[PDB]
Design a protein around this ligand. Structure first.
Ligand SMILES: [Mg+2]
Lengths: 68, 73
């Protein structure tokens, strides 16, 4: 749930969604999203968090290689 | 403009626990003083991909939410 909120705040701060959407989405997610819809959201966010992790590794690897 | 994207990306990595403060600081030093033009290009491409993925995620979440509304009918 923390990942969902973080992601949504990031999207808002970058201008991809507005405040109304942040509120509506998070309310829906917590209280009205079905088990299937939650699974859909979680998979999208999970993929994103995995790609972010991978990016971290790539940056760390690039830095390290440059040093030796 | 790409510079702000790099800083955003780095903050994201830090806030998610992928890097620590020492790495962030060293990375900035490395980027400014030691990174080759190729290495800088590699960093910029990684960050661009991340900003595009973030945009895409937004669309996916908005579309999922929209679909959920329609399915109430
Ligand atoms: Mg986390």
């Amino acid at each position: 749930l923390g990942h969902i909120v973080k992601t949504i705040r990031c999207l808002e701060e970058e201008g991809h969604i507005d405040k109304s959407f942040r509120e509506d989405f998070l309310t829906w997610y917590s209280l009205r999203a079905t088990h299937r819809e939650v699974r859909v959201v979680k998979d999208f966010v999970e993929t994103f968090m995995e790609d972010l992790s991978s990016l971290g590794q790539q940056l760390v690897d690039t830095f390290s290689e440059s040093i030796l």
